[PDB]
Amino acid sequence: GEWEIIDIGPFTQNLGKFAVDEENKIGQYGRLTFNKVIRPCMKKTIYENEGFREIKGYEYQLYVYASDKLFRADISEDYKTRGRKLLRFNGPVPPP
Amino acid sequence: MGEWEIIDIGPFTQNLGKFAVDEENKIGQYGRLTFNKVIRPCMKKTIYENEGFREIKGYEYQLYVYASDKLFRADISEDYKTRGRKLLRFNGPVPPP
Numbered sequence: 001g002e003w004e005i006i007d008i009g010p011f012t013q014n015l016g017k018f019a020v021d022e023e024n025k026i027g028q029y030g031r032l033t034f035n036k037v038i039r040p041c042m043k044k045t046i047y048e049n050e051g052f053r054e055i056k057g058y059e060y061q062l063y064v065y066a067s068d069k070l071f072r073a074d075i076s077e078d079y080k081t082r083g084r085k086l087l088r089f090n091g092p093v094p095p096p
Numbered sequence: 097m098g099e100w101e102i103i104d105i106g107p108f109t110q111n112l113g114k115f116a117v118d119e120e121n122k123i124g125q126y127g128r129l130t131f132n133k134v135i136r137p138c139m140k141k142t143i144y145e146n147e148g149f150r151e152i153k154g155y156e157y158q159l160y161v162y163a164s165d166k167l168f169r170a171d172i173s174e175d176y177k178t179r180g181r182k183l184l185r186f187n188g189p190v191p192p193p
C-alpha cells in the first residue's frame with residue numbers, strides 16, 4: 001500500500017482513544033488513561049491482491065500518550081466492514 | 097519545531113541504513129549485523145533553529161532497515177551544520193510496513 005503523513009485532528013485523536021480503550025480490554029499495561037496522539041501520524045492505504053487500486057482498508061501508526069507515557073499503536077480499519085482493530089501496542093518509547 | 101515528510105529511498109537514504117547498522121554493530125545488542133537495504137516508508141523531520149525565521153538546525157529520520165534478513169526500526173539524527181549523525185534507537189525485529 002502507499003503511506004502518507006496525516007494530521008492529528010479529532011479523527012486521529014479518536015484513533016488514539018480507540019487504541020487505549022482496546023489495550024485496556026487486553027489489560028497488559030493495567031488501566032491506561034488516554035492523553036493525546038502526537039505527530040507524526042502515518043496512514044497506509046491497502047489495495048486488494050486483485051485489480052488496480054481496489055481499496056481493502058487502512059493501517060495507522062500512532063504515537064499516543066497514555067498515563068503520561070508514550071506508546072506506539074498500530075490500528076487496522078477494513079473499508080467494507082468499517083471495523084477497527086488494534087494490531088499492536090508497545091512502549092513506553094522515546095519521543096519522535 | 098519542524099515538519100515531517102515521507103522521503104525517497106535513494107543512496108542518501110540507503111547510506112542512512114548503512115550508518116544505522118554500523119552504529120548498531122558498535123553497540124552490539126543484535127551481534128554483528130549485515131546491512132541489506134532501507135525500505136519505504138522513510139520519514140524525515142526537518143528541525144528548525146530557535147533563531148527567528150525558518151533556518152534548518154538538523155534532521156531526524158525514522159527508517160525501516162533490513163539487516164541479517166531481519167527488519168528493524170532505526171531513528172537517526174543529523175546536525176545541519178556539521179553533518180554529524182547519531183543513532184538514537186535501533187529496535188526489532190518489527191513487523192513489515
Ligand code: NA
Nearest residue numbers: 007009011012
Ligand atoms: Na485526522
